[PDB]
Write a protein that holds these residues in place. Structure first.
Motif, short mmCIF file in Angstrom:
data_model
loop_
_atom_site.label_atom_id
_atom_site.label_comp_id
_atom_site.label_asym_id
_atom_site.label_seq_id
_atom_site.Cartn_x
_atom_site.Cartn_y
_atom_site.Cartn_z
N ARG A 224 -5.78 1.26 9.41
CA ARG A 224 -6.32 2.17 8.40
C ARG A 224 -6.91 1.31 7.29
O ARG A 224 -6.90 0.09 7.38
N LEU A 225 -7.42 1.95 6.25
CA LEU A 225 -7.86 1.23 5.06
C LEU A 225 -6.66 0.97 4.16
O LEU A 225 -5.82 1.85 3.97
N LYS A 226 -6.58 -0.24 3.61
CA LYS A 226 -5.43 -0.64 2.80
C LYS A 226 -5.42 0.06 1.45
O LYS A 226 -4.42 0.02 0.73
N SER A 227 -6.53 0.71 1.11
CA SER A 227 -6.66 1.40 -0.17
C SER A 227 -6.76 2.91 0.02
O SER A 227 -7.38 3.39 0.97
N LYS A 228 -6.14 3.65 -0.89
CA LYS A 228 -6.23 5.11 -0.88
C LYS A 228 -7.20 5.56 -1.97
O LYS A 228 -7.20 6.72 -2.38
N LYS A 229 -8.02 4.62 -2.43
CA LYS A 229 -9.03 4.88 -3.45
C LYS A 229 -10.35 5.30 -2.82
O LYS A 229 -11.29 5.66 -3.51
N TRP A 230 -10.41 5.23 -1.49
CA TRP A 230 -11.59 5.66 -0.75
C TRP A 230 -11.62 7.18 -0.63
O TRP A 230 -10.59 7.84 -0.75
#
Length: 284
Positions: free
Chosen positions: A229-235
């Motif tokens: 997954r993407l390491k950031s939840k800011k996307w």
């Protein structure tokens, strides 16, 4: 197909080399000597054996490089060398001034791209892949370095269709990695879609999953581990959904190319020309 290798002229006078861009054979910044027009030239050493494959790569580029998102084919040439020595094959294609997506990443501060940039590029990569797959062709090597950009921010794909050596595992899809569970590992169309997912993460964070890990361990982990997954939840949650869609371990459960093009991250792109301008402004 019915392609005569002996009919290929010596590139002399026709095309010349200007400088080196990357390696692998080697890829050169070349030039049409009369018109002066630039051209991307891939140079390969060639045996009498590889005559079979060369005949088919040439035939491939000739048929399926006529697409807006695929680097266009100009011609093929052979520099013949003395008996016993290998000859040099030249593949001349469209030259993409702004180089690769990978280059694009090293030139933007933070080494990360605006999501709308990622959206545009992936839509274009998909379109080229869609073209390819419809004509029964697997790209096999989707990564930032095989996604080139012109100076008008036109996304172009290169090096498609092409021993006991292994390579870079980072963009490989679980079904490609041969193991005990998966003995006769073969490439699928959907494999390119996994690679695209890794390529999108490559744009978002700067590097593929497992980047700062030894290639032999990365090859090991990709099957056994969950999908990255993407390491950031800011996307945006669209982008996250798009990574989730591309990156499905089980390819029989993985959406096809047609399915993914309809994905909201790809299909809904206002500011499209806004992105194409900011791209052009970056190419300096």
């Amino acid at each position: 197909d019915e392609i005569d290798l002996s009919a290929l002229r010596d590139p002399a006078g026709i095309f010349e080399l200007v400088e080196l861009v990357g390696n692998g054979g080697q890829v050169y910044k070349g030039r049409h000597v009369k018109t002066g027009q630039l051209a991307a030239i891939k140079v390969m050493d060639v045996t009498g054996d590889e005559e079979e494959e060369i005949k088919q790569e040439i035939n491939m580029l000739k048929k399926y490089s006529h697409h807006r998102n695929i680097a266009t084919y100009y011609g093929a040439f052979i520099k013949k060398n003395p008996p016993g020595m290998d000859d040099q094959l030249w593949l001349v294609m469209e030259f993409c001034g702004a180089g690769s997506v990978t280059d694009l990443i090293k030139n933007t501060k933070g080494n990360t791209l605006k999501e709308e940039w990622i959206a545009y590029i992936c839509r274009e990569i998909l379109r080229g892949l869609s073209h390819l797959h419809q004509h029964k062709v697997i790209h096999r090597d989707i990564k930032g370095q095989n996604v080139l950009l012109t100076e008008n921010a036109e996304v172009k794909l290169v090096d498609f269709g092409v021993n006991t050596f292994i390579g870079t595992p980072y963009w490989m899809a679980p079904e490609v990695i041969a193991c005990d569970e998966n003995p006769d590992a073969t490439y699928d169309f959907k494999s390119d879609l996994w690679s695209l997912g890794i390529t999108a993460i490559e744009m978002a964070e700067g590097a593929p999953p497992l980047c700062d890990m030894h290639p032999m361990r990365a090859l090991f982990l990709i099957p056994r581990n969950p999908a990255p997954r993407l390491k950031s939840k800011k996307w945006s949650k669209k982008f996250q959904s798009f990574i989730e869609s591309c990156l499905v371990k089980n390819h029989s459960q993985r959406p096809a190319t047609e399915q993914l093009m309809k994905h909201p991250f790809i299909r809904d792109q206002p500011n499209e020309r806004q992105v194409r301008i900011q791209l052009k402004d970056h190419i300096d």
